[PDB]
Amino acid sequence: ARKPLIAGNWKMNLNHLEAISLVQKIAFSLPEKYFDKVDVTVIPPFTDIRSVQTLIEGDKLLLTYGAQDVSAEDSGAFTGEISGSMLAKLGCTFVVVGHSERRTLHSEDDAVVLAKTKAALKNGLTPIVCIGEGLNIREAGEHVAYNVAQLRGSLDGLSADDIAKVVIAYEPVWAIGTGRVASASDAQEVCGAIREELKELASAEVAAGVRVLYGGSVNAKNVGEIVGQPDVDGALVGGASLKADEFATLSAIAAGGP
Amino acid sequence: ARKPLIAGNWKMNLNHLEAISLVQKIAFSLPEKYFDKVDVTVIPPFTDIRSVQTLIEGDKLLLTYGAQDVSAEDSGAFTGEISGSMLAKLGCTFVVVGHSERRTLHSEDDAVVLAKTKAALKNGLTPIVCIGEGLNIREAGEHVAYNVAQLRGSLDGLSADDIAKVVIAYEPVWAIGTGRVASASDAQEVCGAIREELKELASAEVAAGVRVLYGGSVNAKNVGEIVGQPDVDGALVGGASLKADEFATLSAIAAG
Numbered sequence: 001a002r003k004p005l006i007a008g009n010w011k012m013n014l015n016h017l018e019a020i021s022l023v024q025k026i027a028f029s030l031p032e033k034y035f036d037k038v039d040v041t042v043i044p045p046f047t048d049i050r051s052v053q054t055l056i057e058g059d060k061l062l063l064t065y066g067a068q069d070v071s072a073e074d075s076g077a078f079t080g081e082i083s084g085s086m087l088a089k090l091g092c093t094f095v096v097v098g099h100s101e102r103r104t105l106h107s108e109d110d111a112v113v114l115a116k117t118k119a120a121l122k123n124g125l126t127p128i129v130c131i132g133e134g135l136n137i138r139e140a141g142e143h144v145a146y147n148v149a150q151l152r153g154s155l156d157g158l159s160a161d162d163i164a165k166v167v168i169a170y171e172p173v174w175a176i177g178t179g180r181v182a183s184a185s186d187a188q189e190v191c192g193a194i195r196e197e198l199k200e201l202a203s204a205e206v207a208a209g210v211r212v213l214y215g216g217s218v219n220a221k222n223v224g225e226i227v228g229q230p231d232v233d234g235a236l237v238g239g240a241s242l243k244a245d246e247f248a249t250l251s252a253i254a255a256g257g258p
Numbered sequence: 259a260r261k262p263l264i265a266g267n268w269k270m271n272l273n274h275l276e277a278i279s280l281v282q283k284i285a286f287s288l289p290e291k292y293f294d295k296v297d298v299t300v301i302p303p304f305t306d307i308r309s310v311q312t313l314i315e316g317d318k319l320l321l322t323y324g325a326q327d328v329s330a331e332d333s334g335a336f337t338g339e340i341s342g343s344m345l346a347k348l349g350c351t352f353v354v355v356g357h358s359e360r361r362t363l364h365s366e367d368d369a370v371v372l373a374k375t376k377a378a379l380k381n382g383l384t385p386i387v388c389i390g391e392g393l394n395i396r397e398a399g400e401h402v403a404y405n406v407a408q409l410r411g412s413l414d415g416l417s418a419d420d421i422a423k424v425v426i427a428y429e430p431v432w433a434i435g436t437g438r439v440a441s442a443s444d445a446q447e448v449c450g451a452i453r454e455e456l457k458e459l460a461s462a463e464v465a466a467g468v469r470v471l472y473g474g475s476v477n478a479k480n481v482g483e484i485v486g487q488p489d490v491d492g493a494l495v496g497g498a499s500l501k502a503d504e505f506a507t508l509s510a511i512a513a514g
């Protein structure tokens with residue numbers, strides 16, 4: 001009974017004028033009947049969010065939107081950082097936290113991701129909590145255990161009510177940017193284990209409601225068998241999200257077609 | 259002479275509505291005649307820049323604006339980062355690089371700051387390159403050498419033409435948000451040392467034109483003595499930049 005979710009992570013691409021054009025094209029390419037069957041959200045750079053807000057609200061589009069990161073702090077002397085309250089006032093629904101690129105390039109560990117998750121929740125945003133193992137962990141066959149500890153650390157101490165407001169994204173690092181998408185059974189194995197660990201972290205009933213996404217080289221050609229898996233509820237899309245035609249097509253596939 | 263520069267670093271404060279309100283108030287409070295004697299820029303959070311751009315351009319205000327950070331990378335798979343071309347398209351004039359809060363909380367070293375400086379220059383932005391020593395360095399009397407070392411690292415290998423396009427902000431860490439402003443003579447000591455080092459990294463003529471700011475608990479009461487020093491060309495303002503009247507007053511003081 002979990003509604004599919006497609007989240008388009010633009011990463012560091014597109015100025016505010018290109019952002020408007022991309023969202024216009026996506027909205028025109030994806031017929032409105034599909035939003036009854038799938039949630040579709042675009043996640044632009046911070047500097048683009050205002051422009052996307054005025055478009056989506058002005059035109060009454062059914063796309064939602066979100067941000068690529070958030071500060072763990074409330075307002076204060078944190079030069080360069082963006083607060084949950086700023087994102088909430090812009091009408092963001094989602095915020096990605098702990099993406100692999102930020103865990104590695106900006107030294108975000110599990111405790112930092114937890115603090116960002118809390119800041120998202122305090123401001124009414126839905127955090128997309130990212131986890132995923134490296135090729136070496138995978139090649140050693142210890143990927144399930146690796147992702148479980150990441151999940152435990154990144155949600156540590158949250159109540160059942162709080163966990164019920166998060167989304168989890170499994171993005172194996174070896175699948176980010178590489179054209180090497182996980183097979184459906186690979187995604188299913190880790191996403192099934194994620195939900196099973198959500199049982200202990202916050203009751204079985206909320207475990208069955210939390211949406212778990214696969215991310216990593218997702219496109220219109222591979223999204224179908226991946227999202228079709230019983231424990232995969234959607235996709236965190238990277239490079240495909242910058243291509244209006246492909247992003248709309250893969251979103252419609254995730255919905256189950258017409 | 260070098261034209262004074264006042265830069266209001268809002269830090270992580272104000273949503274886009276509050277941003278519109280603050281910029282409107284500053285512009286009303288600082289008469290246009292002052293802009294011939296001082297450059298005044300506001301530096302809002304990324305999410306406020308579109309609203310600030312459209313207001314300043316739309317209502318033809320004389321303030322400029324900038325951002326609080328920029329990526330070293332041109333574009334691509336850097337979730338959460340903002341590129342120099344994104345900022346240039348929004349009409350930003352300045353970008354703060356290497357603020358103490360980012361050097362400490364976000365592990366930005368001299369090499370990262372240099373790369374962000376190059377990305378700023380690549381996109382026609384004016385980087386405000388921040389340097390400054392901690393309390394312990396200062397108490398040992400090692401402050402001048404520490405800041406010169408930081409400066410040489412943050413500009414390593416830049417041409418003289420490229421250095422002429424940067425601004426330097428000396429912000430001792432012990433003065434940031436603490437109310438422990440540097441004395442005028444202490445600010446002059448380091449800012450003069452910075453300009454002296456710029457003569458080596460670039461040239462005498464370039465060093466004579468580069469604007470060197472002081473920051474760290476600046477407000478209307480202490481700005482005058484500090485910016486009146488010969489090698490101090492303005493201020494990088496923290497909390498007072500959020501108070502339109504105070505920010506306008508310290509700007510008018512800086513203009514003479």
Ligand code: NA
Pocket residue numbers: 226227228229230231232233234
């Ligand atoms: Na599914």
Ligand code: NA
Pocket residue numbers: 484485486487488489490491492
């Ligand atoms: Na001066």
